[PDB]
């Protein structure tokens, strides 16, 4: 009982167990007869394009200035270099004079 795909596809070939598994979940998922159970979506809300941002909250000043958290991480590395625990930055040219 091959039946063609509704989206203008191809006459399908699935096994009888594959067809029974489709009919099992379709019986659990069917509203009724008579009325159209599967209508198209009328975009009653996305037809109107929103032109302004949703939130009217102010933008914080931290979005316009350099990073606070990056600054605190920099000074932690400065103290490591001050106390000599972390070696300072070596450019790739100095890496070419290395291993």
């Amino acid at each position: 009982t091959g039946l063609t795909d509704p989206n203008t596809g191809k006459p399908l070939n699935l096994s009888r167990d594959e067809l029974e598994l489709i009919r099992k979940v379709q019986q659990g998922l069917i509203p009724d007869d008579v009325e159209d159970p599967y209508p198209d979506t009328v975009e009653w809300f996305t037809s109107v394009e929103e032109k302004m941002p949703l939130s009217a909250a102010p933008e914080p000043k931290r979005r316009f200035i350099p990073s606070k958290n990056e600054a605190k991480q920099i000074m932690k590395l400065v103290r490591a270099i001050r106390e000599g625990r972390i070696l300072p930055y070596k450019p790739p040219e100095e890496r070419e004079r290395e291993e």
Binding site: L3, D5, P6, N7, L12, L14, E18, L21, I22, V25, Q26, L29, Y38, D40, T41, V42, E43, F45, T46, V48, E49, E50, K51, M52, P53, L54, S55, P66, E70, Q73, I74, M75, L77, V78, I81, R82, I86, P88, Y89
Partner: protein
């Protein structure tokens, strides 16, 4: 005859069921994914805006700390994170959105094509949550957004946006409201 393992069979039966049932038109629109050319041209721009890795972020911090022991503008990267990107959508701060087609709780991305449509931001459903994670240095990434690019490539972003609203969103227009599957 031969016997197949349990998780092996269930992988195939879910693939059959998700493509042959009467799929509502918010999951059926995820079956339509952009072309190979458009995906390649998208990742040509996006790879130029890859976020810094943990190795090279640490190197730059060591560079600036060293100069203090012994001047930049805002970094333009690729925006990721579902909660972050949805907020960038809602404040109209995004210019192009890419949505993975294989988010396995699909409820995390069902509203996302329609939300981008409501605010006017061009979107494209893309193959691979793994591909986007590679672009952004994670295992996975459900959504990827571009907000602002550098001045050297404002033209090719606007060209890529026009290639989405012509090559992808025009074909989707009268087939995103229709139910998928059938039989």
């Amino acid at each position: 005859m031969v016997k197949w393992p349990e998780y092996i069979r269930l992988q195939r039966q879910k693939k059959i069921l998700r493509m042959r049932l009467k799929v509502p038109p918010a999951i059926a629109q995820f079956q339509y994914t952009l072309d190979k050319n458009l995906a390649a041209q998208a990742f040509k721009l996006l790879n130029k805006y890859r976020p810094e890795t943990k190795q090279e972020k640490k190197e730059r911090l060591l560079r600036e700390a060293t100069a203090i022991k012994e001047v930049s503008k805002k970094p333009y990267t690729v925006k990721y994170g579902l909660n972050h990107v949805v907020g960038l959508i809602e404040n109209k701060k995004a210019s192009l959105v890419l949505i993975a087609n294989d988010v396995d709780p699909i409820e995390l991305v069902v509203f996302l094509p329609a939300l981008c449509r409501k605010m006017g931001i061009p979107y494209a459903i893309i193959k691979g949550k793994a591909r986007l994670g590679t672009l952004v240095h994670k295992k996975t990434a459900a959504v990827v957004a571009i907000t602002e690019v550098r001045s050297e490539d404002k033209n090719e972003l606007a060209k890529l946006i026009s290639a989405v609203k012509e090559g992808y969103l025009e074909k989707v227009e009268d087939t995103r409201k229709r139910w998928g599957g059938g039989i």
